[PDB]
Write a protein that binds this ligand. Structure first.
Ligand SMILES: O=C(CCCC[C@@H]1SC[C@@H]2NC(=O)N[C@@H]21)Nc1ccc([N+](=O)[O-])cc1
Ligand SMILES: O=C(CCCC[C@@H]1SC[C@@H]2NC(=O)N[C@@H]21)Nc1ccc([N+](=O)[O-])cc1
Ligand SMILES: O=C(CCCC[C@@H]1SC[C@@H]2NC(=O)N[C@@H]21)Nc1ccc([N+](=O)[O-])cc1
Ligand SMILES: O=C(CCCC[C@@H]1SC[C@@H]2NC(=O)N[C@@H]21)Nc1ccc([N+](=O)[O-])cc1
Lengths: 118, 118, 118, 118
């Protein structure tokens, strides 16, 4: 349950995460399989923090989409089953860019993602 | 709309964001006014990314609570009003640590926060 | 804290709730101040249930928009302050209609609303 | 994609929904497989509205838990695949009862559920 490594989710997206430092911080790269405009998809950086001591840590990360003005955050927990298989159970918020504060109500989508190791 | 500086929210929490780098990455600290167990609250680190080009950027950040096994992620947009006042409109997910995957359904809280500058 | 009566929220929307029955069921109407296409807004029906015994009951309701294929659900709690003023604190999910299951990930928005009496 | 009938979800919960009327309104009964205190689980009524014309309608419903002061709302869309199999793709908010308005921030959980016909 070090987030380091390569993962895929139920939508077919993949992400790679680099070494987790002593503070639990990590960087990585996210390839979404889906977007509002999938023709525009490019690789997008992520940055987050996990807990370090827990065997099944909670964590969060931000994805700065490099092809959109939007941002997504993911949070979840890494679980290990009887056979040692890891799953990241996550929920996310996807924030759209709107023109002014009077449109704020329409700007936040929610969903889930389950990730397993590639 | 650089997130650098000190901010307070509607619950009375305060966060301090350091320099935003050329990628839009930032670190800082978060002092929550509230918690499951407020007697345990300690200053906690945050790490996130904002968009750089946009005058009213979207952003995300993760708070690793230093007194809990939980994690929060925030995402939102920084708006500049006609008088130049900045407001962060955010939504958040708070992930609790549970014992095993059968409890995953109970583990994610959602809410909002509006921040203005200190 | 009977939801019967007229209420307004922070976005300026108004809803009117009819008699709450002995099960806590209620119907009413909802006039949203905002929409994807505000030129199309029409008064829309709502249907929900509140708890009956509690002085500060939790509740939920569904709004079937009469001008959209979307649906919103609201859930929250009615609080009575020390002066007897009632506030509904709510969160909502707004479900859009998409063409097929491959688009399901894009279809759910989240937000808040605070209501007070008219 | 009439919600009428018997359904189960990914957590093992079941629900039965009665006839949907001409306004799209329906009642039913929900048996959750999980709860904060599963020893207390009893059958709980639901009340909601679906859209009528759409082949793959959106909908919402409220579950008034009969063993808790909490309430859940579900919203989603009913999809039909090439072989005629129905799936309800839903997101939910679970509202807890808290003592006063200053605890409101902790009171709303979010998640998903996928339902198929029994
Ligand atoms: O499309 C985008 C950017 C890419 C988002 C991919 C999401 S992240 C949650 C989910 N999990 C995945 O692995 N991938 C999806 N942004 C966007 C979408 C819609 C709108 N809009 O205005 O409707 C604006 C920006
Ligand atoms: O209490 C905690 C850790 C601190 C969370 C503070 C939240 S972050 C969203 C909101 N905005 C703020 O400025 N402050 C609040 N975690 C926690 C809470 C509940 C449970 N639980 O099991 O119920 C477990 C851990
Ligand atoms: O616009 C709509 C229908 C009206 C929704 C009003 C929302 S209910 C939550 C909030 N509280 C209020 O009082 N009013 C707002 N639906 C819609 C919106 C966006 C999209 N979309 O595709 O982006 C599709 C349908
Ligand atoms: O436990 C409860 C009542 C039952 C909730 C069942 C949920 S509905 C979303 C999900 N889908 C299912 O089919 N079943 C689950 N309420 C509750 C839970 C936690 C707390 N709390 O304070 O932590 C208070 C009330």
């Amino acid at each position: 349950c070090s987030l380091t490594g390569k993962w895929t989710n139920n939508l077919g997206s993949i992400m790679t995460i680099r070494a987790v430092n002593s503070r639990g911080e990590f960087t990585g790269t996210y390839l979404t399989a889906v977007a509002d405009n999938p023709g525009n998809i490019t690789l997008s950086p992520l940055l987050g923090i996990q807990h370090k001591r827990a065997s099944q840590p909670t964590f969060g990360f931000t994805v700065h989409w490099n092809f959109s003005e939007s941002t997504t955050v993911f949070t979840g927990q890494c679980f290990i089953d009887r056979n040692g298989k890891e799953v990241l159970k996550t929920m996310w918020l996807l924030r759209s860019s709107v023109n002014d504060i009077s449109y704020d109500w329409i700007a936040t989508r929610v969903g889930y993602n389950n990730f397993t190791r590639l």
